[PDB]
Design an enzyme around this catalytic site. Structure first.
Site, PDB file in Angstrom:
ATOM      1  N   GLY A  33       0.687  -1.392  -0.072  1.00 40.34           N
ATOM      2  CA  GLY A  33       0.044   0.004  -0.091  1.00 40.34           C
ATOM      3  C   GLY A  33       0.778   1.356  -0.049  1.00 40.34           C
ATOM      4  N   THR A  34       0.151   2.503  -0.011  1.00 38.00           N
ATOM      5  CA  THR A  34       0.661   3.799   0.199  1.00 38.00           C
ATOM      6  C   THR A  34       1.814   3.824   1.399  1.00 38.00           C
ATOM      7  OG1 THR A  34      -0.709   4.691   1.864  1.00 38.00           O
ATOM      8  CG2 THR A  34      -1.227   4.918  -0.551  1.00 38.00           C
TER       9      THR A  34
END
Ligand SMILES: [Mg+2]
Lengths: 239, 233, 240, 198, 238, 244, 198, 198, 198
Positions: free
Chosen positions: C26-27
């Site tokens: 993810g981010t």
């Protein structure tokens, strides 16, 4: 795809089907009605006979003074149903005064057989059953059959258990749909000969129980049933 | 040839993916199309009611939740009804107790945290339906994009469903225009209508196929059924 | 290797590794403990022009003094926050005094803990960074799917953690006395930009928050507005 | 244990991605050498298809092709055996975990493996190219079809070259792809950084 | 595989459980004083981005009982908590502070119960409890994941168990008593570090280690600074 | 065959368990519904094992209220359940509002019943593993949208129809109906219509025993046509064929 | 890594659906060339079935057929190897997920694979067509049945053509279908847009 | 995509149940042609079993049979390849669902497949019927048992016909049945009307 | 659909249990014909085991046996193919249910199948009985062991008869049993009366 609580591609619940395969494995029962009676016939698996005649069980069972039932399949099971039915038979009468309607009864029974086919972690009753009797303050003979899945059905005369297919055939071309067997005497005469296919001689393998209205009821004695085998083999030889 | 990592909603793939949830999004892509688009005075939902047979009715896809809120759906009716239903309570709780009209940001929160549970526990499965939400609180207009994966995003407009692409683009382009359509409802709609007709293939939309919903600055959430949408064709 | 509870032939819980594997995917999120208080920042990824800016907040406050952010599975993060929210507010009602950051982590660690014990449940798919103040200073920790967490001088997870890591490395030595409350922000602003260069073809929106008795006044406030801008520009110059 | 690791070390230390990168790169442009070995055999089937009858005596241009082909099979096989060597040296301790990386290694080995097998059902056809003709050129004392069978045993063997070449290109290219994708997994099959739990 | 008997009755999940305790990679040793007790554990801080305060494998359970654990930090913090509260609940329900040896019983008990009823996976940690109770003085009992405890006159948990061990054993066949002859803790401490350094073919700075001391009812963790000064102490005297 | 276990999602995002249940309804005997601005008809093929079963015993068509009838198709045991919940759902409403329930509102309740089955429950307890093996032909009349006809599908979804047919020869009729139906169909018309498509895609020689027929109107409410009305209606049918 | 992708790139860049579309399209109408190679061998079995005995010397019209057939096998095989090439270049990173697309690729490869095998049990029968006759035309010194076996070795080989042709059409057509359906999955086997979760 | 469907279309459009119905119907009555090819070879084994010794020279009635049989194998095989063609053209997009229909297709193909294989272990026995006799008729210079082996090589080959014929009838009949039952599943393997859920 | 069922009908209508009952019954007593083919070859091995040397010329009583045996194999195989025919015609619509009955059919087919295979490893040994002796009777110009090898090639082939006969009896009997038990399942493999649920 067999361990049912799931569907076959064609939409089957094979377990529920297989269960029926046991009712066939079991003994045999048959019911018939007239315009005054309803007779229930059954056979007797007289196989390892070195056991007291007296107290050992017999297929037909009274559920209330005016209603009785029979089965075929697992004895082990059957008993438990009969009990739970008998109980509901009173629980009704208590909370409603009025004694049970034969249709209602069956629906209850079928509801139980039906309950044992939904929750995972329970198995269906390997028992199919014939229930007969006359409604309270009523003179119209009622016959119903219930089976493992949960279906109840009213019949003019029906049979279950091993070789039902046969006797069924027989019955089919004997029982007149237009007019039912008038007299009680002959209504019995009928059922008796219909069982003589599978019996293999001897009223020693044939149980008869007869039910009339106004809570009358009455099982049959051996000779009584014999005096019929007699008066039938006679007309068979006369043909 | 094989894939074991797709058993329950509960198992991780070696990389860190939930195929079950991924599939639910596929059934989302299978259902009918629908669109939403906002501005500063109103919000609009436009959907393509799809019928089974020709002797049958078209299955509706819009639902009200309060005078000021609603949504459209792409996917399984049941799943949707539940979610929208739960939603309905949430607004009611606020109104009765606090006597304040439910804020959309927060409406999405709850629908995240709700659908969330189904991705972490054994036994169940995830929600097979997506929703476009619209509403008008104190921060003016708002519009939401919700996925079964519990992801709710605040947008300016969008579409979901089969062949949802062509509208997403029409929108992507005509943006600069409509975000400025304030004070005029019929305009936002015709706009929205065009954005959707920009995705048909079987055929054009009729009075029976069409359905619209709106909500705004003095326009409590209301829906337009059949012959009532007649004009916008 | 397929169930959550089980152990490998030499003591290993695979489901947790994959949990980790998704956290990375993810981010990217970070945080920094400075003079007094902390500073956080995350990476919202603008996938289209149809996203209202200044909107979908990934950072969340707890009580009225704890910053908090993460990355990996977004709904998992949100969920975890709620539990943390009860625990806090319950404690508060009980002991009156706002909850000590030191223990807070455990309360959460203990909850993330559980989801590694039974097979019927799914491991927490997020790494979480957070901190706040109290009486005995500000603190900052970082919780992983395994439930194991610790105190760091600054933390990082999600996609490009190394970028910010070696980046965080430097700061330590040149400012071995805690970086300025103010400079902390603008510096964070940069450290993000640098680490974003993977989603480079895809534009983005940076979000920042912080805590400080001097700046926030014991509280946790969202870095938005004027300080927010210059902090960007500040990053924008070094961005060469 | 001190000495034991040194061997496993100095071995992996003399072969690497550094080495394999050159086979992929080397067998990248080198396909030209095959895209050539092709067109040659082609131009040649036309002369055999049409260069009506004769009185025998071993064709020089044909052996020029088989020598050039058998020549190529040789290179490739050695070059593959090098890639194979680089991997077998990275097969980790056998056990029932982290077998994700290990699996890749095996799968790739099976494909490489195939390549080598392909270069061996025809990488001998020269000593076999002139192996049926000593039987064919004999019976020098005449079927008018036997004369034609010599016309064929020349063209047939020229077809086998063109065809083996065609397939071969494919196999190589496949292998290029396959490597380029996985590789890192091939050298680093276990990670083991997962001690973030202890 | 799963938690129910093998064909030779040895359900491996319990066995597997063990490697993981070890797997962490730290060495824990412990010995008795005469009016104090001590445990040694290593403090390897890799990531230059963390904070050594927040690190440790030893926690203050009670006013007098401390605990060290060679095992994965998440699972430890759990055991830590429950135990920490069992004693808390005890003093309340019974009038007197709970001793070492006992906590280790409900503790092993607990880990047994889990294991048999299947209400969760066992924690992969070995707990080493220490203190001094006025019934048996310098006490040292250890517990494993296979739900089981016992007593040690001085023990060790780690990747390199038997080494740390054998030394002490040999030092014991000679000192012949079942503990460490000496009055001051500082002095005992010195002794262990000593017996560990010697035991690893390794040296430690003032942060590379972790140690605790159990006194006459006042258990305390050894901090960064005081820790170094013992290295001063045991440098010349060697 | 992997991907056949109730709450499991196919990789194309599909639930077969559900889809098969539909395949159950197939096996049921045929049922047909026709809505006319005059009234609504419900007719079903009976199909009896032996001549010793008393036809009326098969409750393929049943009353749910003075204003709402119904015909089922497929699993008979499952039917009895839906029929009972429905019957109850109706009365309950009347006790609460002193009025009649909107056909669809009722129908809704029934579909609300159907899709309410869990597998250990990811939140909501749902005591009943799998879906229903039966569909419904609900047909009544509220005073808001007049005469109404509905299709109850185990999937928890439903549709409103002008004419629909479920059971064995589903398409055999649906095709037929697809081009026989028109608004201004009178009631008498509709009867002879159902009665024709049955006979066609039916199995045996059509007669009152193998075919139960019913209807419901604003006037009298749900009435199940005795064997006389049906019998003669057969004649008005088998007679017009002779001509054209 | 910069250079590494460039190769994988310039390779997939020189073959594509654009290329394969022409084989499906090319081998679409080209079936006529086979529906022909059929009728030819047929007309021919009648002359052999009835063109009573002889005194030998290699039939010119027969080699005209085998040359035409062996000719076709050649084309097709090269054409297939091209489709095969287009796919092997698209086989994604080996792992245990998204294998839905990958699976398609393999299944199609196995069917293509079969096609190529079919063109090789008979794509040599010319050098074999006249391979049993040098043994058959010899023993020139007479079984009156041996004379008839020459009548047969001519007709038998004309049957094999008709038959191989019949089956072949089928194989091709199957392949056309198979490609036309899947294809997009064949080039785009992984999507990866599922990052709507992170 | 416009052009792509057109091909898949015009192809399935030129073969169908309409076509296959005639093979089932064609190969229905045509069994007579086999129930005949049977009785012929039978009457013939009696003459060989009893037509004591000789001095050789190729039997005309025997080849009349093998020509008639090899003749039939041909028809059938072409006829099967047609049914095969009709199905391969209906194999849906490869995936892991609705495979109930697809499965049927395969099963049936495997049985047809068998049929074709059966017509090829004996559909060549003419060029082989007279293939052991040139070896048998030679050695013309005499075992008094060798004379009898010629009596047998005639009757043995007449038995093989009767037997292959017997089995063959069976195979055909099985296939007729198999088709007649499934078929609809064969052309319509996926339905897809299940969108009553969306 | 009207016509379609008629074929499947008139086919099953011309074969049945009525037919098969006669094979079981026919191949019941007919075992005597084998219990005989046994005792004959036995009495014969004694004359070969002891009927010291000779000067050759084809034994008449031996061919009398192989002719009688090869004769039997023929009957049986045809008789089996008939039972096989009766079943293949009853193989129901392919699907994944009620496969209990279908399974029986297959199992029985595999056993019948075996029977037929057994009658074919020796149902040709006449054309082979005198097939090694032309090689054995030649080399007429003498190993004094070669003379004895002729004594053996006569007795060896008489043993094979006795033995094949022995096993065969067994196979048949097994098959009789197997059919007699199942059978009803073989013709009625699905029931379908289970509609007592709808
Ligand atoms: Mg567990």
């Amino acid at each position: 795809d067999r361990a049912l609580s799931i569907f076959s591609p064609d939409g089957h619940i094979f377990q529920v089907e297989y269960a029926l395969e046991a009712v066939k494995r079991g003994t045999c029962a048959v019911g018939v009605k007239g315009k005054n009676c309803v007779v229930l016939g059954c056979e007797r698996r007289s196989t390892l006979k070195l056991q007291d005649t007296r107290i050992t069980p017999s297929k037909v069972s009274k559920i209330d003074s005016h209603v009785v039932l029979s089965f075929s399949g697992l004895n082990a099971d059957s008993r438990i149903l009969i009990e739970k039915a008998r109980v509901e038979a009173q629980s009704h009468r208590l909370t409603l005064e009025d004694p049970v309607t034969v249709e209602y009864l069956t629906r209850y029974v079928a509801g139980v057989q039906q309950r044992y086919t939904q929750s995972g972690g329970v198995r269906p009753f390997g028992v199919s059953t014939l229930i007969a009797g006359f409604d309270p303050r009523d003179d119209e003979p009622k016959l119903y059959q219930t089976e493992p899945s949960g279906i109840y059905s009213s019949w003019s005369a029906q049979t279950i258990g091993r070789n039902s297919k046969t006797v069924r055939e027989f019955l089919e071309k004997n029982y007149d749909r237009k007019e039912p067997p008038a007299t009680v005497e002959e209504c019995v005469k009928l059922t008796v000969r219909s069982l003589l296919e599978v019996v293999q001689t001897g009223a020693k393998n044939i149980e008869i129980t007869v039910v009339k209205p106004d809570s009358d009821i009455v099982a049959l004695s051996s000779e009584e049933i014999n005096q019929y085998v007699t008066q039938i083999e006679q007309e068979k030889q006369e043909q | 040839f094989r894939n074991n990592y797709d058993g329950d909603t509960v198992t991780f793939s070696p990389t860190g993916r939930l195929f079950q949830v991924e599939y639910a999004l596929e059934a989302i892509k299978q259902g009918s199309v629908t669109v939403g688009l906002r501005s500063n005075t109103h919000a609009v939902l436009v959907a393509l009611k799809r019928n089974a047979d020709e002797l049958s009715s078209y299955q509706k896809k819009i639902i009200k939740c309060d005078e000021h809120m609603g949504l459209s759906l792409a996917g399984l009716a049941p799943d949707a009804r539940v979610l929208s239903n739960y939603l309905r309570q949430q607004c009611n709780y606020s109104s009765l107790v606090f006597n304040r009209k439910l804020a959309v940001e927060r409406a999405g929160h709850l629908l995240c945290d709700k659908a969330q549970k189904n991705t972490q526990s054994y036994g169940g499965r995830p929600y097979g339906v997506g929703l476009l939400i619209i509403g008008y609180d104190k921060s003016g207009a708002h519009l939401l994009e919700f996925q079964p994966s519990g992801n709710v995003t605040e947008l300016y407009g969008t579409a979901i469903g089969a062949r949802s692409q062509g509208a997403k683009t029409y929108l992507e382009r005509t943006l600069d225009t409509f975000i400025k359509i304030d004070g005029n409802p019929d305009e936002l709609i015709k706009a929205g209508v065009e954005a959707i007709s920009q995705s048909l293939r079987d055929e054009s939309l009729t009075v029976d196929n069409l359905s619209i919903a709106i909500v705004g600055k003095d326009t409590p959430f209301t829906i337009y059924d059949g012959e009532a949408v007649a004009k916008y064709i | 290797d397929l169930s959550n509870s089980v152990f490998s032939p030499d003591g290993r819980n695979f489901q947790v590794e994959y949990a980790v594997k998704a956290v990375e995917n993810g981010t990217t999120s970070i945080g920094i403990k400075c003079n007094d208080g902390v500073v956080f920042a995350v990476e919202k990824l603008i996938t289209s022009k149809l996203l209202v800016p200044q909107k979908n907040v990934k950072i969340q406050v707890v009580d009225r003094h704890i910053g908090c952010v993460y990355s990996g599975l977004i709904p998992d993060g949100r969920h975890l926050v709620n539990r943390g929210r009860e625990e806090a507010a319950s404690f508060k009602k009980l002991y009156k005094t706002p909850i000590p950051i030191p223990a807070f982590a455990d309360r959460l660690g203990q909850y993330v803990q559980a989801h590694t014990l039974y097979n019927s449940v799914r491991p927490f798919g997020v790494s979480t960074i957070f901190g706040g103040v109290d009486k005995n200073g500000a603190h900052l920790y970082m919780l992983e799917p395994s439930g194991s967490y610790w105190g760091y001088k600054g933390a990082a997870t999600g996609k490009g953690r190394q970028s910010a890591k070696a980046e965080l490395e430097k700061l330590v030595d040149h400012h071995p006395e805690g970086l300025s409350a103010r400079e902390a922000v603008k510096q964070a602003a940069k450290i993000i930009y640098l680490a974003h260069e993977d989603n480079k073809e895809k534009d983005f929106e940076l979000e920042i928050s912080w805590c400080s008795l001097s700046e926030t006044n014991g509280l946790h406030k969202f870095v938005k507005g004027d300080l927010l801008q210059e902090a960007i520009d500040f990053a924008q110059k070094e961005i060469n | 244990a001190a000495l034991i690791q040194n061997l496993r070390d100095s071995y992996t230390e003399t072969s690497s991605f550094a080495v394999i990168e050159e086979w992929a790169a080397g067998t990248l442009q080198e396909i030209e050498g095959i895209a050539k070995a092709a067109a040659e055999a082609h131009g040649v089937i036309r002369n055999s298809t049409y260069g009506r009858a004769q009185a025998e005596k071993s064709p020089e241009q044909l052996l020029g092709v088989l020598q050039r082909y058998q020549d190529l099979c040789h290179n490739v096989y050695c070059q593959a055996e090098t890639i194979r060597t680089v991997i077998a040296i990275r097969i980790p301790e056998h056990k029932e975990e982290d077998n994700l990386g290990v699996a890749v290694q095996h799968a790739v080995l099976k494909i490489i493996d195939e390549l080598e097998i392909k270069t061996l059902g025809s990488g001998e056809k020269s000593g076999s190219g002139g192996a049926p003709t000593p039987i064919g050129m004999y019976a020098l004392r005449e079927s008018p079809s036997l004369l034609l069978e010599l016309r064929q045993i020349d063209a047939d063997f020229m077809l086998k070259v063109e065809l083996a070449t065609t397939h071969l290109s494919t196999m190589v290219r496949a292998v290029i792809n396959a490597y380029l994708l996985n590789w890192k997994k091939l050298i680093q099959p276990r990670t083991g950084t997962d001690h973030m739990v202890s | 595989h799963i938690t129910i008997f093998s064909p030779e009755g040895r359900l491996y999940q319990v066995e597997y459980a063990f490697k993981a305790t070890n797997q962490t990679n730290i060495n824990s040793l412990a010995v008795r004083g005469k009016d104090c007790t001590v445990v040694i554990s290593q403090k390897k801080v890799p990531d230059k981005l963390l904070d050594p305060t927040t690190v440790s494998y030893i926690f203050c359970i009670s006013r007098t009982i401390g605990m060290v654990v060679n095992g994965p930090i998440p699972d430890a913090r759990n055991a830590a908590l429950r135990a920490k509260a069992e004693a808390a609940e005890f003093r309340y329900k019974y009038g007197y502070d709970m001793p070492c040896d006992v906590l280790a019983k409900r503790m092993a008990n607990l880990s047994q119960i889990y294991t048999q009823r299947a209400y969760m996976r066992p924690l992969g940690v070995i707990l080493t409890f220490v203190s001094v109770d006025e019934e048996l003085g310098p006490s040292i009992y250890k517990t494993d994941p296979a739900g089981y405890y016992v007593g040690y006159k001085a023990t060790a948990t780690g990747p390199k168990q038997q080494e740390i061990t054998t030394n002490l054993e040999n030092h014991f066949k000679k000192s012949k008593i079942d503990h460490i002859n000496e009055e001051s803790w500082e002095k005992v401490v010195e002794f262990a570090i000593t017996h560990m350094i010697d035991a690893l073919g390794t040296e430690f700075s003032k942060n590379d280690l972790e140690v605790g001391v159990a006194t006459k009812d006042k258990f305390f963790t050894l901090s960064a600074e005081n820790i170094e000064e013992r290295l001063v102490a045991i440098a010349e005297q060697d | 065959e992997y991907d056949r276990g109730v709450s499991t999602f196919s990789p194309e995002g599909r639930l077969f368990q559900v889809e098969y249940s539909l395949e159950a309804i197939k096996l049921g005997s045929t049922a047909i519904g026709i809505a006319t601005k005059e009234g609504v008809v419900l007719g079903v093929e009976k199909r009896a094992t032996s001549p010793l079963l008393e036809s009326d015993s098969i409750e393929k068509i049943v009353e749910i209220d003075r204003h709402i009838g119904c015909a089922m198709s497929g699993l008979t045991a499952d039917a009895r359940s839906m029929i009972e919940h429905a019957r109850t759902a109706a009365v309950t409403h009347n006790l609460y509002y002193d009025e009649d329930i909107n056909v669809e509102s009722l129908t809704q309740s029934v579909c609300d019943l159907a899709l309410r089955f869990g597998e250990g429950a990811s939140g909501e307890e749902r005591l009943m593993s799998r879906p229903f093996g039966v569909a419904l032909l609900i047909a009544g009349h509220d005073a808001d949208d007049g005469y109404q006809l509905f299709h109850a599908e185990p999937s928890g979804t439903f549709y409103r129809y002008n004419a629909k047919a479920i059971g064995s020869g589903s398409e055999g009729a649906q095709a037929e109906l697809l081009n026989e139906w028109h608004s201004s169909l009178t009631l008498k018309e509709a009867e002879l219509l159902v009665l024709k498509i049955l006979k066609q895609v039916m199995e045996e020689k059509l007669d009152e025993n193998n075919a139960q027929l019913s209807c419901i109107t604003k006037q009298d409410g749900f009435k199940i046509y005795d064997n006389e009305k049906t019998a003669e209606l057969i004649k008005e049918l088998k007679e017009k064929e002779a001509a054209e």
